[PDB]
Tab-separated table of all heavy atoms in Angstrom:
chain	number	residue	atom	x	y	z
O	1273	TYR	N	-5.125	25.347	-12.991
O	1273	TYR	CA	-5.758	25.654	-14.271
O	1273	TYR	C	-4.748	25.545	-15.412
O	1273	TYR	O	-5.045	24.967	-16.470
O	1273	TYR	CB	-6.377	27.060	-14.241
O	1273	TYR	CG	-7.311	27.351	-15.397
O	1273	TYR	CD1	-8.688	27.310	-15.223
O	1273	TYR	CD2	-6.812	27.672	-16.659
O	1273	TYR	CE1	-9.552	27.575	-16.282
O	1273	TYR	CE2	-7.662	27.932	-17.722
O	1273	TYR	CZ	-9.027	27.882	-17.527
O	1273	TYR	OH	-9.877	28.141	-18.580
O	1274	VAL	N	-3.570	26.116	-15.198
O	1274	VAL	CA	-2.508	26.078	-16.208
O	1274	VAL	C	-2.073	24.636	-16.500
O	1274	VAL	O	-1.858	24.264	-17.651
O	1274	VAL	CB	-1.299	26.917	-15.766
O	1274	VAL	CG1	-0.109	26.703	-16.704
O	1274	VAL	CG2	-1.670	28.389	-15.716
O	1275	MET	N	-1.971	23.813	-15.462
O	1275	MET	CA	-1.489	22.442	-15.647
O	1275	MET	C	-2.418	21.613	-16.522
O	1275	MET	O	-1.972	20.976	-17.477
O	1275	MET	CB	-1.297	21.737	-14.293
O	1275	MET	CG	-0.683	20.337	-14.419
O	1275	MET	SD	-0.111	19.667	-12.822
O	1275	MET	CE	1.179	20.843	-12.418
O	1276	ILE	N	-3.709	21.610	-16.208
O	1276	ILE	CA	-4.632	20.797	-16.981
O	1276	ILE	C	-5.055	21.557	-18.245
O	1276	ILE	O	-5.269	20.946	-19.292
O	1276	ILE	CB	-5.871	20.366	-16.141
O	1276	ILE	CG1	-6.751	19.385	-16.933
O	1276	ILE	CG2	-6.665	21.569	-15.664
O	1276	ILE	CD1	-6.004	18.121	-17.400
O	1277	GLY	N	-5.131	22.882	-18.147
O	1277	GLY	CA	-5.556	23.716	-19.271
O	1277	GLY	C	-4.567	23.689	-20.420
O	1277	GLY	O	-4.929	23.970	-21.568
O	1278	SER	N	-3.320	23.339	-20.115
O	1278	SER	CA	-2.288	23.175	-21.135
O	1278	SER	C	-2.676	22.102	-22.152
O	1278	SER	O	-2.149	22.091	-23.262
O	1278	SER	CB	-0.938	22.825	-20.501
O	1278	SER	OG	-0.953	21.522	-19.946
O	1279	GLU	N	-3.589	21.204	-21.786
O	1279	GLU	CA	-4.073	20.219	-22.748
O	1279	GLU	C	-5.593	20.132	-22.868
O	1279	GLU	O	-6.111	19.587	-23.847
O	1279	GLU	CB	-3.521	18.838	-22.408
O	1279	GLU	CG	-3.941	18.329	-21.055
O	1279	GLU	CD	-3.597	16.866	-20.848
O	1279	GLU	OE1	-3.611	16.092	-21.833
O	1279	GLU	OE2	-3.319	16.492	-19.690
O	1280	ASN	N	-6.318	20.644	-21.880
O	1280	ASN	CA	-7.770	20.538	-21.904
O	1280	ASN	C	-8.411	21.707	-21.161
O	1280	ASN	O	-8.583	21.666	-19.941
O	1280	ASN	CB	-8.211	19.195	-21.310
O	1280	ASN	CG	-9.681	18.895	-21.534
O	1280	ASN	OD1	-10.512	19.796	-21.658
O	1280	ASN	ND2	-10.010	17.613	-21.583
O	1281	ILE	N	-8.764	22.752	-21.909
O	1281	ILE	CA	-9.341	23.958	-21.323
O	1281	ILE	C	-10.707	23.683	-20.696
O	1281	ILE	O	-11.021	24.228	-19.633
O	1281	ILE	CB	-9.453	25.091	-22.384
O	1281	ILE	CG1	-8.069	25.678	-22.666
O	1281	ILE	CG2	-10.392	26.193	-21.921
O	1281	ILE	CD1	-7.515	26.525	-21.519
O	1282	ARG	N	-11.514	22.837	-21.336
O	1282	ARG	CA	-12.822	22.489	-20.790
O	1282	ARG	C	-12.702	21.886	-19.393
O	1282	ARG	O	-13.457	22.244	-18.501
O	1282	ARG	CB	-13.569	21.521	-21.709
O	1282	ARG	CG	-14.344	22.211	-22.816
O	1282	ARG	CD	-15.297	21.252	-23.510
O	1282	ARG	NE	-16.458	21.950	-24.057
O	1282	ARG	CZ	-17.619	22.073	-23.423
O	1282	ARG	NH1	-17.773	21.546	-22.216
O	1282	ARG	NH2	-18.627	22.724	-23.992
O	1283	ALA	N	-11.742	20.984	-19.215
O	1283	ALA	CA	-11.479	20.393	-17.907
O	1283	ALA	C	-11.027	21.442	-16.896
O	1283	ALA	O	-11.455	21.421	-15.736
O	1283	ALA	CB	-10.434	19.297	-18.029
O	1284	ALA	N	-10.153	22.350	-17.330
O	1284	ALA	CA	-9.713	23.444	-16.468
O	1284	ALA	C	-10.916	24.285	-16.000
O	1284	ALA	O	-11.017	24.636	-14.828
O	1284	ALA	CB	-8.703	24.307	-17.182
O	1285	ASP	N	-11.835	24.587	-16.916
O	1285	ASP	CA	-13.034	25.350	-16.565
O	1285	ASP	C	-13.921	24.596	-15.577
O	1285	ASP	O	-14.482	25.194	-14.650
O	1285	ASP	CB	-13.855	25.692	-17.821
O	1285	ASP	CG	-13.218	26.782	-18.663
O	1285	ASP	OD1	-12.438	27.594	-18.123
O	1285	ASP	OD2	-13.534	26.845	-19.870
O	1286	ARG	N	-14.056	23.288	-15.786
O	1286	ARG	CA	-14.872	22.442	-14.923
O	1286	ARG	C	-14.316	22.448	-13.501
O	1286	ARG	O	-15.065	22.489	-12.524
O	1286	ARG	CB	-14.928	21.012	-15.465
O	1286	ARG	CG	-15.922	20.110	-14.752
O	1286	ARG	CD	-15.720	18.647	-15.127
O	1286	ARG	NE	-15.687	18.438	-16.573
O	1286	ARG	CZ	-14.719	17.789	-17.215
O	1286	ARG	NH1	-13.696	17.276	-16.543
O	1286	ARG	NH2	-14.775	17.649	-18.533
O	1287	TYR	N	-12.993	22.397	-13.390
O	1287	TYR	CA	-12.377	22.412	-12.059
O	1287	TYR	C	-12.673	23.731	-11.359
O	1287	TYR	O	-12.990	23.748	-10.171
O	1287	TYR	CB	-10.857	22.193	-12.128
O	1287	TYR	CG	-10.421	20.757	-12.367
O	1287	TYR	CD1	-9.294	20.479	-13.126
O	1287	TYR	CD2	-11.131	19.688	-11.834
O	1287	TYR	CE1	-8.882	19.171	-13.349
O	1287	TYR	CE2	-10.727	18.369	-12.055
O	1287	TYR	CZ	-9.597	18.123	-12.810
O	1287	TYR	OH	-9.194	16.826	-13.043
O	1288	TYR	N	-12.563	24.844	-12.082
O	1288	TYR	CA	-12.896	26.131	-11.484
O	1288	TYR	C	-14.367	26.185	-11.067
O	1288	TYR	O	-14.686	26.735	-10.014
O	1288	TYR	CB	-12.566	27.286	-12.437
O	1288	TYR	CG	-11.158	27.840	-12.284
O	1288	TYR	CD1	-10.156	27.115	-11.627
O	1288	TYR	CD2	-10.821	29.097	-12.787
O	1288	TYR	CE1	-8.871	27.627	-11.494
O	1288	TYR	CE2	-9.549	29.609	-12.658
O	1288	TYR	CZ	-8.571	28.873	-12.015
O	1288	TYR	OH	-7.304	29.394	-11.886
O	1289	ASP	N	-15.260	25.621	-11.877
O	1289	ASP	CA	-16.685	25.573	-11.518
O	1289	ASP	C	-16.879	24.802	-10.208
O	1289	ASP	O	-17.634	25.212	-9.325
O	1289	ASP	CB	-17.530	24.908	-12.616
O	1289	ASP	CG	-17.666	25.758	-13.884
O	1289	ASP	OD1	-17.435	26.984	-13.846
O	1289	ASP	OD2	-18.034	25.173	-14.923
O	1290	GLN	N	-16.188	23.678	-10.091
O	1290	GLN	CA	-16.338	22.817	-8.922
O	1290	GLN	C	-15.724	23.450	-7.673
O	1290	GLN	O	-16.317	23.401	-6.592
O	1290	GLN	CB	-15.724	21.443	-9.207
O	1290	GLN	CG	-16.514	20.693	-10.276
O	1290	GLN	CD	-15.824	19.446	-10.787
O	1290	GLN	OE1	-14.613	19.275	-10.636
O	1290	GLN	NE2	-16.600	18.562	-11.408
O	1291	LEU	N	-14.554	24.060	-7.823
O	1291	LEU	CA	-13.881	24.693	-6.694
O	1291	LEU	C	-14.660	25.911	-6.216
O	1291	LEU	O	-14.808	26.129	-5.016
O	1291	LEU	CB	-12.447	25.076	-7.073
O	1291	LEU	CG	-11.538	23.849	-7.161
O	1291	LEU	CD1	-10.305	24.175	-8.003
O	1291	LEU	CD2	-11.117	23.374	-5.768
O	1292	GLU	N	-15.179	26.696	-7.157
O	1292	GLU	CA	-15.982	27.854	-6.787
O	1292	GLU	C	-17.264	27.426	-6.076
O	1292	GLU	O	-17.633	28.018	-5.064
O	1292	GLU	CB	-16.321	28.701	-8.018
O	1292	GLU	CG	-17.145	29.940	-7.679
O	1292	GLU	CD	-17.631	30.671	-8.913
O	1292	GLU	OE1	-18.023	29.997	-9.890
O	1292	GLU	OE2	-17.630	31.915	-8.897
O	1293	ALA	N	-17.928	26.397	-6.597
O	1293	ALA	CA	-19.161	25.900	-5.987
O	1293	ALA	C	-18.917	25.423	-4.548
O	1293	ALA	O	-19.707	25.711	-3.647
O	1293	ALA	CB	-19.754	24.783	-6.826
O	1294	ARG	N	-17.818	24.708	-4.329
O	1294	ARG	CA	-17.501	24.238	-2.981
O	1294	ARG	C	-17.140	25.400	-2.063
O	1294	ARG	O	-17.514	25.410	-0.894
O	1294	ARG	CB	-16.355	23.225	-3.011
O	1294	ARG	CG	-15.989	22.707	-1.633
O	1294	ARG	CD	-17.023	21.728	-1.112
O	1294	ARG	NE	-16.709	20.396	-1.600
O	1294	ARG	CZ	-17.541	19.636	-2.297
O	1294	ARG	NH1	-18.767	20.062	-2.564
O	1294	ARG	NH2	-17.143	18.442	-2.709
O	1295	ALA	N	-16.399	26.376	-2.582
O	1295	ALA	CA	-16.041	27.534	-1.775
O	1295	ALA	C	-17.285	28.314	-1.361
O	1295	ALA	O	-17.336	28.859	-0.258
O	1295	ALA	CB	-15.079	28.432	-2.521
O	1296	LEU	N	-18.284	28.347	-2.241
O	1296	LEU	CA	-19.557	28.995	-1.921
O	1296	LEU	C	-20.317	28.220	-0.847
O	1296	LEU	O	-20.911	28.822	0.050
O	1296	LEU	CB	-20.412	29.143	-3.180
O	1296	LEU	CG	-19.864	30.171	-4.172
O	1296	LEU	CD1	-20.742	30.250	-5.414
O	1296	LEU	CD2	-19.720	31.531	-3.511
O	1297	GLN	N	-20.306	26.894	-0.940
O	1297	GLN	CA	-20.926	26.032	0.070
O	1297	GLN	C	-20.257	26.275	1.425
O	1297	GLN	O	-20.917	26.353	2.464
O	1297	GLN	CB	-20.831	24.543	-0.330
O	1297	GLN	CG	-21.744	23.608	0.490
O	1297	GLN	CD	-21.552	22.112	0.210
O	1297	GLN	OE1	-20.773	21.710	-0.656
O	1297	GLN	NE2	-22.267	21.278	0.969
O	1298	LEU	N	-18.935	26.393	1.401
O	1298	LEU	CA	-18.162	26.621	2.616
O	1298	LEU	C	-18.485	27.971	3.260
O	1298	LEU	O	-18.518	28.092	4.488
O	1298	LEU	CB	-16.664	26.530	2.298
O	1298	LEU	CG	-15.682	26.776	3.431
O	1298	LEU	CD1	-15.946	25.820	4.573
O	1298	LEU	CD2	-14.258	26.615	2.900
O	1299	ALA	N	-18.725	28.992	2.444
O	1299	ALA	CA	-19.069	30.300	2.991
O	1299	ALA	C	-20.422	30.257	3.703
O	1299	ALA	O	-20.622	30.958	4.691
O	1299	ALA	CB	-19.073	31.354	1.902
O	1300	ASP	N	-21.338	29.427	3.206
O	1300	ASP	CA	-22.647	29.240	3.847
O	1300	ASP	C	-22.549	28.335	5.072
O	1300	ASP	O	-23.350	28.435	6.003
O	1300	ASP	CB	-23.661	28.640	2.866
O	1300	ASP	CG	-24.120	29.624	1.799
O	1300	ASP	OD1	-23.968	30.846	1.991
O	1300	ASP	OD2	-24.645	29.160	0.769
O	1301	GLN	N	-21.561	27.447	5.060
O	1301	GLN	CA	-21.410	26.427	6.094
O	1301	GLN	C	-19.949	26.328	6.514
O	1301	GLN	O	-19.255	25.373	6.159
O	1301	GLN	CB	-21.905	25.075	5.590
O	1301	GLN	CG	-23.419	25.025	5.377
O	1301	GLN	CD	-23.801	24.329	4.096
O	1301	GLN	OE1	-22.940	23.928	3.317
O	1301	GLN	NE2	-25.100	24.182	3.869
O	1302	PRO	N	-19.482	27.319	7.276
O	1302	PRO	CA	-18.045	27.493	7.521
O	1302	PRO	C	-17.372	26.358	8.290
O	1302	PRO	O	-16.150	26.235	8.221
O	1302	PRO	CB	-17.984	28.804	8.323
O	1302	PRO	CG	-19.372	29.026	8.842
O	1302	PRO	CD	-20.285	28.423	7.826
O	1303	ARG	N	-18.131	25.540	9.004
O	1303	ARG	CA	-17.533	24.481	9.798
O	1303	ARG	C	-17.780	23.106	9.167
O	1303	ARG	O	-17.709	22.079	9.841
O	1303	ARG	CB	-18.063	24.547	11.250
O	1303	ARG	CG	-17.662	25.840	11.979
O	1303	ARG	CD	-18.133	25.878	13.435
O	1303	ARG	NE	-17.692	27.094	14.125
O	1303	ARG	CZ	-18.428	28.197	14.255
O	1303	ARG	NH1	-19.646	28.249	13.736
O	1303	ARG	NH2	-17.948	29.253	14.903
O	1304	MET	N	-18.022	23.078	7.851
O	1304	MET	CA	-18.346	21.823	7.177
O	1304	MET	C	-17.111	20.955	6.975
O	1304	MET	O	-17.220	19.753	6.788
O	1304	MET	CB	-19.028	22.072	5.820
O	1304	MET	CG	-18.142	22.721	4.767
O	1304	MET	SD	-19.075	23.073	3.245
O	1304	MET	CE	-19.276	21.420	2.591
Side-chain angles (χ1 to χ4, degrees):
Chain O
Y1273 193 102
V1274 171
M1275 185 167 296
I1276 186 57
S1278 69
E1279 61 169 328
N1280 191 332
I1281 286 288
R1282 275 192 152 265
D1285 286 336
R1286 189 192 309 128
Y1287 283 145
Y1288 270 18
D1289 289 341
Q1290 293 169 341
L1291 286 160
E1292 181 188 40
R1294 180 74 86 236
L1296 290 179
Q1297 194 186 356
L1298 178 57
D1300 288 341
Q1301 292 137 357
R1303 296 183 178 95
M1304 67 184 287

